[PDB]
Design a protein around this ligand. Structure first.
Ligand SMILES: CCC(O)(O)CCCCC[C@H](NC(=O)C1CN(C)C1)c1[nH]c(-c2ccccc2)nc1C(N)=O
Ligand SMILES: [Ca+2]
Ligand SMILES: [Ca+2]
Ligand SMILES: [Zn+2]
Length: 368
């Protein structure tokens, strides 16, 4: 039935600024929080302020030199780190900004704290909209991500769970998470993403893992314009087959909202209901679940999406009419929660969707 939900948020998160022209806006996390507060969703959740994850907690995955660099670099001393900046991929996508390290500490803190709460059996679901930064690598920042809070949260879950399932519905391939666990069968990574002339360039349907991890990485490559009908047609069947074969004891779901229609960087056509149907599908399996954020660059739609997904986690129905809130004007001209899909062509034909699903089903038959 209805589950206990723990939500992680730090009121300072919205003040971190990647810089003029950068599409990543931490302010969208504050818009989400304010909208969900004005809908009354705080009365049903346990709200926690995450601790600032230590450099030591981060080195459970990342290299000591990379974390030392992140903790040392600032806009005022950047000139002395031009060598390490190239080495760790700090530049246009992953710039040096005021409070960069503290932003990583809060993003990571929420994910690891949520994983600890799930491990202690003190909650059914844990939510950290500031997390989900799936591109960060062991010793390299990538695609607006510096510390891989997801990998750290999964390593925490692995202390009490033999098998953990990771599902990623961001429009971009979950490469950092897939790479971290590519050679192990203790984590199965499943990513649905746009593939073809698109960042990060990985996630081919033929990338299925290696060594003991062979068949434990699943990639569903998609073309522009996928809609609710098409996404829904493959998501539940694939996740059901993965649950059946893999039998995970905990799940981590990255809810990147850049897969929504009208995203500034994305080219998909999902509505908030279509995106949230993924949360409903996963929630139905009644397993300990960590829900994380990720991409999302049309910030009014990211706030709508994550507010609705928090309501889904709580089994709470909320009206389409938006309540008054601190950012009300951002939701014009309609001031409604739900969004309409665009007229863009769906390049993912029904036959293509079925064919890719059948190839993934063949790989899933190879599990023990
Ligand atoms: C948080 C998780 C997430 O998956 O959502 C992150 C998405 C990251 C997208 C990064 C992308 N970067 C690239 O395409 C650059 C081109 N190569 C040098 C790499 C990129 N960078 C930028 C960018 C634009 C303006 C200023 C800075 C970066 N746009 C894009 C783009 N349209 O794909
Ligand atoms: Ca993905
Ligand atoms: Ca794996
Ligand atoms: Zn993305």
């Amino acid at each position: 039935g209805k589950k206990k939900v723990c939500y992680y948020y730090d009121g300072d998160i919205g003040n971190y600024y990647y810089g003029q022209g950068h599409p990543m806006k931490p302010h969208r996390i504050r818009m989400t929080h304010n909208l969900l507060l004005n809908y009354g969703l705080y009365r049903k959740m346990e709200i926690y302020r995450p601790h600032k994850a230590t450099a030591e907690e981060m080195t459970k995955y990342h290299s000591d030199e990379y974390i030392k660099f992140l903790r040392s670099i600032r806009p005022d001393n950047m000139s002395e780190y031009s060598k390490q900046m190239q080495r760790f991929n700090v530049g246009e996508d992953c710039p040096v900004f005021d409070g960069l390290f503290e932003f990583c500490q809060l993003s990571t803190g929420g994910s690891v704290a949520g994983a600890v709460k799930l491990n202690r059996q003190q909650t059914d679901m844990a939510v950290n909209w500031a997390g989900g930064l799936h591109h960060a690598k062991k010793s390299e920042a990538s695609g607006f991500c510096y510390v891989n809070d997801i990998v750290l949260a999964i390593l925490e879950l692995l202390k009490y769970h033999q098998r953990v399932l990771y599902i990623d519905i961001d429009i971009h391939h979950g490469d950092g998470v897939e790479e971290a666990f590519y050679t192990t069968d203790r984590v199965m990574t499943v990513s649905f993403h746009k593939y073809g002339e698109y960042f990060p360039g990985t996630g081919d349907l033929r990338d299925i893992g290696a060594g003991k991890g062979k068949y434990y990485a699943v990639n569903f490559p998609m073309r522009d314009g996928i809609d609710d009908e098409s996404y829904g047609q493959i998501f539940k069947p694939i996740i059901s087959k993965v649950m059946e074969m893999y039998q995970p004891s905990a799940v981590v779901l990255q809810c990147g909202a850049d897969s929504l229609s009208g995203d500034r960087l994305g080219c998909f056509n999902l509505t908030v209901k279509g995106h949230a149907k993924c949360v409903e599908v996963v929630k139905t399996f009644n397993l300990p679940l960590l829900m994380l954020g990720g991409g999302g660059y049309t910030i009014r739609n990211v706030a709508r999406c994550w507010t609705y997904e928090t309501a889904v986690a709580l089994d709470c129905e909320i009206p389409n009419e938006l309540p008054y809130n601190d950012y009300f004007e951002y939701f014009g001209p309609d001031f409604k929660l739900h969004i309409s899909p665009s007229n863009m062509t769906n390049q993912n034909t029904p036959e293509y969707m079925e064919k890719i699903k059948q190839r993934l089903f063949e790989n899933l038959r190879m599990l023990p």
